[PDB]
Design a protein around this ligand. Structure first.
Ligand SMILES: [Co+2]
Length: 205
């Protein structure tokens, strides 16, 4: 039984390191869907720390704008510029894309050559919700193959790192193992094929 823990909306040197510290504590791998505007010399080391620690990096666009109604040139620029900064500091190229706001269109699918991922959400962008509530949303929603969509970066209070102290032990005790997105596809025997123009919330579709 496999799940993929994924985190949007960083990197942030302070908030992302809180998530990375919990993943180090439990020796778990995850995937970070990063925003190009945030990837720069100040955040180079923490982006590299993801790679160094066995995590994967995917693309969450240059910024925080929905992309469904953008033009092909706007889409291409946003994805390419984000890939270029990830390559500079991480030395890797994304295979996966998470659309801002999970909003898609045929034009967006047509102009992004990455595998689109969504996933099970946990209301963890709502500061009034507690660590325990965020954990309960995840634990009760997963199944074998689920992609879990959390945020490493949001306005505070943001007790997502604290939710991991419940999510990770609970799911392990139920027989789950945590994997990156690439590992999830590979271990399930699903080609990571960007010509598939569907959004994956789990693997297999
Ligand atoms: Co986002």
């Amino acid at each position: 039984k496999l799940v993929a823990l994924t985190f949007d909306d960083g990197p942030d040197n302070v908030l992302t390191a809180r998530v990375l510290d919990k993943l180090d504590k439990y020796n778990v791998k995850a995937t970070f869907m990063v925003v190009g505007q945030r990837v720069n010399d100040s955040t180079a080391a923490i982006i590299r720390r993801m790679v160094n620690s066995g995590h994967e990096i995917g693309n969450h666009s240059w910024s925080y704008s929905g992309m469904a109604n953008m033009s092909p040139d706007q889409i291409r620029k946003s994805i390419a510029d984000t890939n270029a900064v990830i390559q500079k500091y991480a030395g890797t190229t994304p295979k996966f894309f998470r659309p801002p706001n999970l909003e898609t269109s045929p034009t967006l699918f047509n102009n992004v050559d990455l595998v689109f991922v969504g996933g099970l959400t946990a209301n963890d962008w709502i500061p009034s919700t507690t660590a325990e509530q965020r954990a309960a949303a995840v634990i009760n929603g997963v199944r074998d193959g689920t992609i879990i969509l959390l945020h490493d970066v949001q306005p505070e209070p943001h007790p997502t790192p604290e939710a991991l102290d419940i999510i990770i032990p609970t799911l392990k005790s139920r027989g789950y193992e945590f994997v990156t997105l690439t590992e999830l596809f590979t271990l399930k025997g699903v080609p990571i094929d960007p010509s598939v123009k569907r959004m994956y919330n789990s693997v297999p579709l």
